[PDB]
Amino acid sequence: PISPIETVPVKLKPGMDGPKVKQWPLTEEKIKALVEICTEMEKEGKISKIGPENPYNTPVFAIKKKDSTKWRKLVDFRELNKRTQDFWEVQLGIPHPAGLKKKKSVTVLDVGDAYFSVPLDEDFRKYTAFTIPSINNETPGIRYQYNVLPQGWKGSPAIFQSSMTKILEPFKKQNPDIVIYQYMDDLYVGSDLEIGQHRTKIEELRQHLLRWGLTTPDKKHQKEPPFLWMGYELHPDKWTVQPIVLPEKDSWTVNDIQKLVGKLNWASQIYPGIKVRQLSKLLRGTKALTEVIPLTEEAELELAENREILKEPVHGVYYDPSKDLIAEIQKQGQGQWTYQIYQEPFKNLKTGKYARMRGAHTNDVKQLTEAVQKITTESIVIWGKTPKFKLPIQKETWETWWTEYWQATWIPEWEFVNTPPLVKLWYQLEKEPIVGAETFYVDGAANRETKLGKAGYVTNKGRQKVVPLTNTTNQKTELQAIYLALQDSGLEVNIVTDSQYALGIIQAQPDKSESELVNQIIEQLIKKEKVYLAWVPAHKGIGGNEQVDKLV
Amino acid sequence: PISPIETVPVKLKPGMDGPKVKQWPLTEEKIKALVEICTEMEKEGKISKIGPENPYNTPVFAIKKKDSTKWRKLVDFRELNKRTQDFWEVQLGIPHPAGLKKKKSVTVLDVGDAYFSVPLDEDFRKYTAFTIPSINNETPGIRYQYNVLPQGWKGSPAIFQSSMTKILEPFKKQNPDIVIYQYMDDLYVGSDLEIGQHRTKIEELRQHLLRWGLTTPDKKHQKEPPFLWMGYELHPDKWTVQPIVLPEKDSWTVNDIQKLVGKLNWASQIYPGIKVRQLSKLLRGTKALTEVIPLTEEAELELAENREILKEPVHGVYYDPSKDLIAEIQKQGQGQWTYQIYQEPFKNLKTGKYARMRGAHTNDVKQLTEAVQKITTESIVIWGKTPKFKLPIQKETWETWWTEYWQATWIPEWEFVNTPPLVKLWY
Numbered sequence: 011p012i013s014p015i016e017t018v019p020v021k022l023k024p025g026m027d028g029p030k031v032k033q034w035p036l037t038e039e040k041i042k043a044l045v046e047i048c049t050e051m052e053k054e055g056k057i058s059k060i061g062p063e064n065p066y067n068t069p070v071f072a073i074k075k076k077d078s079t080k081w082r083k084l085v086d087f088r089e090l091n092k093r094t095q096d097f098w099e100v101q102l103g104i105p106h107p108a109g110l111k112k113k114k115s116v117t118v119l120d121v122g123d124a125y126f127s128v129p130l131d132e133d134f135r136k137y138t139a140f141t142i143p144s145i146n147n148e149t150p151g152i153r154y155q156y157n158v159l160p161q162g163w164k165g166s167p168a169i170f171q172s173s174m175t176k177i178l179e180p181f182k183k184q185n186p187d188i189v190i191y192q193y194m195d196d197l198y199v200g201s202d203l204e205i206g207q208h209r210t211k212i213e214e215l216r217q218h219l220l221r222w223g224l225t226t227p228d229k230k231h232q233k234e235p236p237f238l239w240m241g242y243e244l245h246p247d248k249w250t251v252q253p254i255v256l257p258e259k260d261s262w263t264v265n266d267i268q269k270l271v272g273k274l275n276w277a278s279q280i281y282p283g284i285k286v287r288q289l290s291k292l293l294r295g296t297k298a299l300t301e302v303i304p305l306t307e308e309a310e311l312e313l314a315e316n317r318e319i320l321k322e323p324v325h326g327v328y329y330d331p332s333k334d335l336i337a338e339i340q341k342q343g344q345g346q347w348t349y350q351i352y353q354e355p356f357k358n359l360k361t362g363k364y365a366r367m368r369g370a371h372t373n374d375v376k377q378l379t380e381a382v383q384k385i386t387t388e389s390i391v392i393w394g395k396t397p398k399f400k401l402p403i404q405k406e407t408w409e410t411w412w413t414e415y416w417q418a419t420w421i422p423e424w425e426f427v428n429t430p431p432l433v434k435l436w437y438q439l440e441k442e443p444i445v446g447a448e449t450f451y452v453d454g455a456a457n458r459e460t461k462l463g464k465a466g467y468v469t470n471k472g473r474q475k476v477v478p479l480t481n482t483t484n485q486k487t488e489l490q491a492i493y494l495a496l497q498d499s500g501l502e503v504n505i506v507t508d509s510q511y512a513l514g515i516i517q518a519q520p521d522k523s524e525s526e527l528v529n530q531i532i533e534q535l536i537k538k539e540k541v542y543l544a545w546v547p548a549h550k551g552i553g554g555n556e557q558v559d560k561l562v
Numbered sequence: 563p564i565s566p567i568e569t570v571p572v573k574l575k576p577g578m579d580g581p582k583v584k585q586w587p588l589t590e591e592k593i594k595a596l597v598e599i600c601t602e603m604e605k606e607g608k609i610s611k612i613g614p615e616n617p618y619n620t621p622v623f624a625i626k627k628k629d630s631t632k633w634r635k636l637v638d639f640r641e642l643n644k645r646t647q648d649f650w651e652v653q654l655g656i657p658h659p660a661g662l663k664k665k666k667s668v669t670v671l672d673v674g675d676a677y678f679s680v681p682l683d684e685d686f687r688k689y690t691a692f693t694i695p696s697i698n699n700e701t702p703g704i705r706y707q708y709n710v711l712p713q714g715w716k717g718s719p720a721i722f723q724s725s726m727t728k729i730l731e732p733f734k735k736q737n738p739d740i741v742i743y744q745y746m747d748d749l750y751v752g753s754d755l756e757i758g759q760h761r762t763k764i765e766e767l768r769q770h771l772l773r774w775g776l777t778t779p780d781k782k783h784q785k786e787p788p789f790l791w792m793g794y795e796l797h798p799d800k801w802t803v804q805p806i807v808l809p810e811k812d813s814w815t816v817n818d819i820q821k822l823v824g825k826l827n828w829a830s831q832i833y834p835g836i837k838v839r840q841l842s843k844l845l846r847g848t849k850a851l852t853e854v855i856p857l858t859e860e861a862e863l864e865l866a867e868n869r870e871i872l873k874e875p876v877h878g879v880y881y882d883p884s885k886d887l888i889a890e891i892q893k894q895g896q897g898q899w900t901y902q903i904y905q906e907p908f909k910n911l912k913t914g915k916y917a918r919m920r921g922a923h924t925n926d927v928k929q930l931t932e933a934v935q936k937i938t939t940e941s942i943v944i945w946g947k948t949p950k951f952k953l954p955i956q957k958e959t960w961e962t963w964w965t966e967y968w969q970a971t972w973i974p975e976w977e978f979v980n981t982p983p984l985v986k987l988w989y
C-alpha cells in the first residue's frame with residue numbers, strides 16, 4: 011500500500027506558508043462516511059491522527075455520484091497548491107503514434123490508487139492537514155495529516171511519475187524489449203512475446219511493483235485493444251483516429267464551425283487529402299460564440315468532400331527504423347498542400363497538410379519550401395531524423411528560385427516526382443530594360459477620404475491614359491496603373507512605378523492571390539513576353555509621375 | 563578532483579526566477595551524443611541527475627567540436643545569462659581592452675576546459691538544469707544540473723576571472739605588449755609580431771597555461787599538411803571600411819541614372835549631405851529607358867561631389883555602451899553576404915561583407931551561420947560584446963539547422979526578418 015521509496019523534498023513558494031481554510035458543517039451520515047474512510051486509511055498508514063499544533067487546514071468533502079456502493083473522501087487543495095513550488099512538467103508533448111513501434115502484446119495495468127502508495131516528503135506533511143468535524147458539540151474535531159500523495163495536490167502527478175520511473179528503471183534495463191509507457195491512471199506494457207510468456211513478464215513487473223508498495227489489480231472494468239488513447243485508437247500493428255463525427259445541421263454557429271474544423275485537422279494525421287481552407291475562411295470573424303454563420307457555398311462543398319473521405323475507414327502503420335522514411339507533398343490549389351509520410355507503398359505512417367494562412371501574397375515554390383520545412387520539423391520530433399522527399403518540383407525551378415530569393419533556405423534530400431499539378435515559375439521579370447520596348451511611366455493616386463482615385467500612364471511614345479476609379483486606395487490605384495500599362499502595352503514592355511508596394515508584390519513573383527486585381531495582373535504578366543519593372547522614388551522623384559499626380 | 567576552491571555565492575537579479583526554457587527536439591544521433599557525454603560528465607562529477615522539484619531548464623545541443631572525432635555539448639545559457647550575468651557584468655565585470663582590435667594578430671584559444679574543477683555555489687545549481695530529450699517524447703527526458711561552473715554561462719568566466727589573471731600574470735610580465743582578453747570561454751591573445759613569432763608566442767602561452775593546469779585542445783594539426791589551416795587567427799588592423807561606391811560610366815542610360823538616383827536617395831538617410839535634383843532633373847522627362855543620355859550643369863558636379871561626401875565615414879557615430887549592438891545581414895547571392903552592425907538606424911558602427919566559395923560544397927544556411935559567427939567574433943573583439951542578429955531566413959529553417967555548422971562556444975541573440983527591401987541594392 012505504501013513503499014520504501016525515497017521522498018522528493020518539497021517546498022512552499024518563498025514567502026508563503028501553510029493553508030488555513032476551514033469548513034466545519036456536518037452531514038452526520040457523511041461524517042461517519044469519512045471517519046470510516048480515514049480509519050481504514052490511517053490504519054493503512056496513508057494518513058495520521060495529528061496533534062493540534064499549527065496545522066493549517068484544508069476542506070474535506072464526502073462524495074458519491076452514481077451507482078453507489080461506496081463514498082469518496084475529497085479534499086480541496088486549491089489553497090495549498092497556490093502555495094507550493096513548481097515541479098518539472100509532465101508530458102510537455104504527447105508522443106505521436108506514427109512514431110511508436112510495432113508490438114505483439116500490449117497490456118495496461120491500473121496504476122490509479124498508486125500515488126497513495128508513494129511517500130510524501132515528511133516535512134511537507136504538516137501542511138496537508140485537513141480536519142473532519144465531529145457532528146456537533148464543536149468538539150476537538152477528528153484531525154489528520156497526509157503521509158502519501160494527496161489526490162488533489164500540485165506535486166503529486168510529478169513526484170509520482172518521478173517515483174514510478176525510478177522503480178521501473180531496473181526492470182526496464184533487464185528487459186529492453188518491453189515498452190513501458192504510463193499515462194496518468196494507466197501504465198501500458200507492450201512486448202514481442204506470445205500472450206503466454208508475455209503474461210509472465212507482466213506478472214513479474216506486477217510483483218516487482220508490489221515489492222515497492224505500489225499494488226495493481228488483475229481484472230476490473232474496461233476492454234483491451236483497440237485502446238482508446240489521447241483521442242487515438244491503438245492497435246498492436248496499426249493505429250488510427252478515434253471514430254470522428256461530422257454532424258449535419260440546419261444552422262451552424264461559430265462554436266459549431268470551430269469544433270467541426272478542429273475535428274478535421276485531427277482527422278488529417280492519417281486521412282489523406284482532407285481540406286479545410288473554406289470552413290475556416292468563415293471563422294475569420296473571431297467575435298461571437300453563438301453568432302450564426304451561413305455555410306457559404308464552398309465551405310459546404312468542402313465539408314462534403316470531407317465526408318467522402320471520412321466515409322472510408324483508414325489506419326496507419328508504425329515505424330521500422332530499418333527502412334527509409336519518405337515524404338511526399340502535392341498541391342491542392344488554394345494555398346492548400348498535402349503530404350503523407352511512409353516507408354511502405356500502401357499503408358501510410360502519417361499524413362498531414364500545410365496551408366498558407368499567413369498574409370495575402372505568396373509564391374508556389376516558397377510555399378513548397380514552407381511545407382517541406384513543416385515536415386522536416388515534424389519528422390525530427392517524431393522519428394529523430396529527416397525524411398527523404400519526393401516533390402512536384404524540378405531542380406531547374408528550385409535551384410533557380412533559391413538563387414534569386416533574398417532569404418536563405420536549405421531544402422534537404424529530394425527526388426523529383428512528375429505528377430500534376432506541378433510547381434513552376436509561370437513567368438520571370440527581366441533583369442535589364444528592354445530595348446525598343448515602349449516605356450510606360452505608370453502612376454495612380456487616390457483620395458484617402460473620398461475614396462476616389464486615378465490610374466494612368468504616359469509613354470515615351472507620347473501615349474497617355476487616365477482611368478477614374480472609385481472606392482479604392484493608393485495601393486489599389488498603384489497596381490491598377492501597372493495593370494493598365496500591361497493591358498495597353500505590347501508583348502514587351504518597360505514599366506516604371508513609384509510604388510515599393512507594387513514593385514515588391516510583383517517581384518515576389520506570386521503564383522496567385524485571391525485579390526482579383528493582382529490576378530488580372532499576374533495573368534497579364536504571364537501573357538507578356540518580356541516585362542521589366544523599375545522602381546523610382548515618389549514625390550521628389552521623376553517628372554513623369556508628377557505629370558500624372560497633378561492629374562489625379 | 564580535490565576542491566580547487568570553496569564556492570562563490572550567486573544571486574539572480576531580484577524579481578527574477580531561474581530559467582524555464584523548452585528544450586528543442588533533436589536528431590536521434592545528437593541525442594546519443596548528449597547521452598554519452600552526460601554519462602561521463604556524471605561520472606566525472608561535473609553533473610548530477612535531478613528530481614521533479616527542479617522546475618528549471620536551459621536548452622542543450624550537440625555540435626561537432628571542430629569536426630573532431632566527436633560531439634560537443636553546447637548549453638544555450640542565453641536565458642540564464644540575462645538573468646544573472648548581467649548583474650555579474652557588474653558584480654564581476656570582465657573589463658574590455660580597446661587595443662585588441664589594433665593588434666597585427668589575434669588568436670582565439672578555448673579555455674572553457676578550466677571551469678570544470680571549480681564547484682558551483684550549491685544554492686545555484688538548481689538553475690542550470692538542462693534536459694537531454696527523447697525521440698517522440700516516449701520517454702521522460704533525462705535530467706541534469708551542473709556541479710561546477712559550466713561552459714556557456716557568463717558567470718563561469720567571471721568567477722574564474724580571478725584565478726585566470728593569476729595564471730596569466732607571470733606571462734603578461736614577459737610579454738607586456740601582448741594583450742589577452744577573455745570572453746566567456748575563449749582567450750583572445752593579440753600580438754604585433756610577424757606571424758611566425760606570434761604563433762610561437764602562442765604555443766609559448768598554450769604551454770604556460772598547460773603546465774599550470776588548463777588544457778587548450780587547440781592542437782589543430784601537426785607537421786603533415788592535409789590542407790587544414792591553423793588556429794583561429796584574426797587580423798583586426800586590416801578590419802577596414804567596405805566599398806559603397808556608385809558606378810563610374812562611359813555612357814549612361816535613363817535606367818542607369820534612375821537606379822543611381824535611388825541608391826543616393828536611399829543613402830540620404832545615412833548621409834544627409836547628399837543631393838540629387840540636378841541629377842534627378844535629368845529624368846524629369848518620360849524618355850525611353852534604353853536611351854543613353856548626358857550630364858547636366860553641375861550633374862558631373864553632384865555625382866563627383868556626392869561621390870566624395872561618400873568616401874569618408876560619417877560623423878556623430880559613436881559607440882554607446884548602454885545600448886545593444888544590432889546586426890543586419892542581407893543575402894547578396896553567389897556566396898556573398900553583406901552586414902551592418904549598428905545601435906540606431908543608419909549610424910553604422912561598422913559594415914563589411916562575408917563570402918564563401920563556389921557552389922558544389924556550400925549552401926545558404928551554412929554561409930549565414932558562418933557569417934554570423936564571424937560577425938559575432940568581430941564584434942566581441944571590437945566591443946567586448948556580441949550583437950543581436952536580424953537574420954534573413956525563415957525562423958524554423960534556422961532553428962532547424964543553425965547547430966548544423968555552429969562551432970562557436972556562444973550564442974548570439976537573434977530574430978528573423980522577412981523583408982530586406984532596397985538595402986541589398988545600396989550595399
Ligand SMILES: N#Cc1ccc(Nc2nc(N)nc(Oc3c(Cl)cccc3Cl)n2)cc1
Nearest residue numbers: 105110111113116189191198200244245246
Ligand atoms: N494496441 C497497441 C499498441 C501500444 C503501443 C505500441 N508501441 C509502442 N512503442 C513504443 N516504443 N512506445 C510505446 O509507448 C506507448 C504505450 Cl506502450 C502505450 C500507449 C502510448 C505509448 Cl506512446 N508504444 C504499439 C501498439
